[PDB]
């Protein structure tokens, strides 16, 4: 059938190096664009990550349903609030930057 | 009798019985790679909680970032105590970040022996402390 | 009956044992399409064949030109003409195919530049009928070929509907009017008793080296199937013949294989000299196994012996290329180090002759069918087979040839399977069984379970071991032997006194380690009494009072003009021992060996001769 | 004389409402072999014979006696007793397994899982089998080295926190390394379909590279490393 399990494991790795790539690249080159991908990478990576924490510890079809749902909400909400902050406020690069000289 | 059935029968027999489960966490020697595996969750999790709070506070709360900074400037901040909260944040990001690379290397198959584990383990711990102390004073 | 819950099962075939033979027979039967139970007191992989290091003989001719008929000659020459040449033919011929099937099952043999199974030199094996030098026909998986044999056999057995009664202790056969109906077994796990009945019952319980103090065999090698046969009133052939493998570590009694000698390695005494060149000029250290331990043991009496207390001889590996102990001998590199604190690559190894293999066992056809002795002739027992160390078609006679027992397993294991395939169909009416049947195995179970006596199972066992050690050793005489016999017959009496403590149902190691002891005495009774009756030196049985190999002629002098000796005045015959269950009373008898091969045209009988290696 | 303390796990299932506890025993090391199992067999024979455990080969090559000695899974018959009399040896059964009794854990699942990966040669044309020896080059054979000596002691799998919390559905390192053994067998023709069977969250993918498994293997083998090789194969087999 589908080789789904191996793709997801590969997806995971990819964004992890993409995300490894952006922490340097957003010190060197802050901007709207970096801010959005740093959001897209941060949130995707962490969502899959907790994914694994969830599939490890959360036993039963009962709870593993809710947890994977509630998670996905939190993920989406989080990606949207980061995007909001990038649009209508400072944006993560400059926000971190400001936070630091303080 | 097939493998799937064997497994099925293993579970019904043992669950409905007076059989004690052997100890584990309470008995098992702590090895650096196992403590460094656990930390890699904690950090990952703690970090994701931070990012999510930063996303959710951007939506559910009012005031902009400068507004919030001004509020967070005017608590008569202690110059060391800033470094604390700062270093307390750069720490997990660095530990997890370095160890992250360690993993990816393993994913490629490089570095999977007890010697190399305990070397890399240390090299992370160091790098962390360097980059953590480093950045907290940038 | 009412105290112990009894479950009844019904199959086409039961196999007691899951070593090389057990598995091979059990899975072969299953493949042949037989609903087949395999009772084994251990997880099949923990069976003893695992510990086999050396290899598996088959004239494949990967290393040179070879002929299985030369391997025949070698084996019968190794049997000291106690070997039945019909079975030896059957084996040596069927061995190429038997090994190739193992390679084809996924067994990861070591390889040549040709891509073919790698073979090596091994104890006392020739080309061109004993005149063509040392021969290389020992197939192997580096130093762990038993391990790999046993796992690839276990692995493949899962591919069929083989019913694995794992950790079930067989107690006795289910005989009825001379025919075997199956086995009755304890289920170590839940304490209950099971009666597994089939049309055909195959005994592959392996050896009983645990009758002695020092032995290479594992704690589970306790003659259980040999004993059940004895408890059925059936004979046990040749139990006197006990191979003292020459290289077994001082303390632990752990084997460092004969493949260490087959790879150029030497046996050294305490005065520098390779003491094996004087004793056997032709073959040297790579000579027969009764001869090499006889030499090592005969060196120690003099005081040529080495070490802290002058009682153990040195194996030497150090010179070979340090390369060659990485590829061909990794298993003994580790475990000679672990149990001796010895670096095999720079230090010679501390060894000593200890018990190793039992060429005695349950008497058998070349077909695997178990024989009784009726009016001085052979009679197949219906529905009952055996194979492996447990059995005795005596393809090994008075001395097993190095690397033939693993071959044995695979060949005869497969033979029993085949004999049943050939002679009956799956489904065929599984014969009835008295409701009282098995009653006494349980009664015995229960009395041992609650035994409140004076002597402890461990201490009683330890008396037997050091007795069989100090009386049934490498060298022996009628005086020592007889004292041993009455000494060991006393101990069988002592069994009524014995003390168990643990009184539970679930995993009663005490209760079974004692059931095991019962079994061990029966094997030792028959081993020692038989040995004191045998008034000659053939094979690994070496009497100081009868240093002479007693045949039906004098085969040193040319044959004609000799007056042939009558059956009851020459020792070239199989010992058949019995024992009265209730008095420990050994009666014994004899049946002639077999010399006709399966076909003169194809493989021509090798008549007895002088036996210098 | 040099007496040594031996804190051992015990639980009788035949003793109504008994619950896991530790006994101590006491052994003169002058009157004992160097390995822990020697001490175990000694107390078994000379003191308490209710003490129960698995053992056969005492050679470190059958896998019977695997158990938790001083917090680490090894074969008792090959681990040597701490001659420092000041410490007290702690023997437990293997971790997070159902005790049948005393030191004996129920490994049916362990074996069941082994069975499930079909640890045997599979060829596409088996019409020819038993009749000719298959060609495998000395290079092809080297790829099996370090994989085939697995003794199935269950030290590794049962030292894996993933197996601890997901051993019903996570195969664990012992079994996985064997699947790898049959994957990289040149002679085997089902490598793809063997990989396919691992496509799901649990079978392979609970491995989070913790590496207790390789760290505890009493035979020097590297199951963790094999898990990684599979994952790489898994990420890259076509069809
Ligand atoms: C250290 C060592 C190295 C050796 N090396 C070699 C070698 O290199 N080459 C070679 O050819 N030979 C070698 N041998 C000899 C050979 O390996 C054995 O003779 C052979 O392994 C026996 O196979 P088997 O199946 O008959 O018995 P085993 O392998 O002992 O199997 C016995 C089976 O019977 C079962 N059993 C026993 N009692 C009961 C009971 N009451 N109820 C149910 N089941 C029971 C056990 O569970 C087990 O499954 C070696 C022996 C030793 C000790
Ligand atoms: C360059 C930066 C980073 C790298 C290279 C990286 C790498 C990794 C890798 C490889 C894993 C999987 C390890 C495994 O279990 O096999 C992982 C897990 C995880 N990471 Fe990251 N990471 C980074 C930053 C972050 C950040 C910023 C967050 C959150 C804000 C985060 C959250 C997580 C979480 C939640 C997990 C799952 C924890 C687990 O499975 O145990 N990571 N990380
Ligand atoms: C005895 C201590 C050191 O041992 C423990 C105890 C509890 C949890 C764990 N560690 C995990 O639980 C863990 C950690 C990181 C990644 C995956 C896991 C996993 F697989 F889910 F099990 C280890
Ligand atoms: S791998 Fe090492 S530990 Fe895991 S089972 Fe095979 S041997 Fe025991
Ligand atoms: S101990 Fe466990 S998580 Fe993975 S690599 Fe090793 S199996
Ligand atoms: S008992 Fe065989 S491995 Fe220790």
Author numbering:
A (entry chain D): 35 to 136
B (entry chain C): 6 to 143
C (entry chain A): 10 to 622
D (entry chain B): 9 to 247
Show sentences the authors wrote.
The enzymes of the fumarate respiration are anchored in the inner mitochondrial membrane where complex I (NADH-rhodoquinone reductase) acts as a proton pump that is driven by the oxidation of NADH to NAD+ and coupled to the reduction of rhodoquinone (RQ) to rhodoquinol (RQH2), while complex II, serving as a RQH2-fumarate reductase (QFR), transfers electrons from RQH2 to fumarate. In contrast, mammalian complex II catalyzes the reverse reaction in mammalian mitochondria, where it acts as succinate-ubiquinone reductase (SQR) in the aerobic respiratory chain. Since fumarate respiration is the major pathway of energy metabolism during adaptation to a hypoxic environment for many species of parasites including adult A. suum and bacteria inhabiting anaerobic environments as well as some human cancer cells exposed to low nutrition and low oxygen conditions, the pathway is one of the most promising targets of chemotherapy for both parasitic diseases and cancer. In spite of the similarity in amino acid sequences and three-dimensional structures between A. suum QFR and porcine SQR, flutolanil specifically inhibits the enzymatic action of A. suum QFR.
Flutolanil (N-[3-(isopropyloxy)phenyl]-2-(trifluoromethyl)benzamide), a commercially available fungicide, is made up of two aromatic trifluoromethylbenzene and isopropoxybenzene rings that are connected by a peptide bond linker. This compound is a potent inhibitor for A. suum QFR (IC50 = 0.058 μM) but poorly inhibits porcine SQR (IC50 = 45.9 μM). To obtain insight into its high specificity and potency against A. suum QFR, the X-ray structures of A. suum QFR and porcine SQR in complex with flutolanil were determined at approximately 2.9 and 3.0 Å resolution, respectively. The determined structures indicate that in each enzyme, flutolanil is bound to the quinone binding site via hydrogen bonds with three conserved residues (A. suum QFR: Trp 197B, Arg 76C, Tyr 107D; porcine SQR: Trp 173B, Arg 46C, Tyr 91D), and there are 13 residues within a distance of 4.0 Å from the bound flutolanil, most of which are conserved in the amino acid sequences of both enzymes. In the porcine SQR-flutolanil complex, like A. suum QFR, the trifluoromethylbenzene ring is surrounded by a similar set of residues (Pro 169B, Ser 170B, Trp 173B, His 216B, Ser 42C, Arg 46C, Asp 90D, Tyr 91D) and the η1-nitrogen atom of the guanidino group of Arg 46C donates a hydrogen bond to the trifluoromethyl substituent with a distance of 3.2 Å. However IC50 values of the derivatives 1 and 2 are comparable with that of flutolanil. This is probably due to the unfavorable arrangement of the guanidino group and the benzene ring for the electrostatic interaction. In fact they poorly overlap with each other and are separated by more than 3.7 Å.
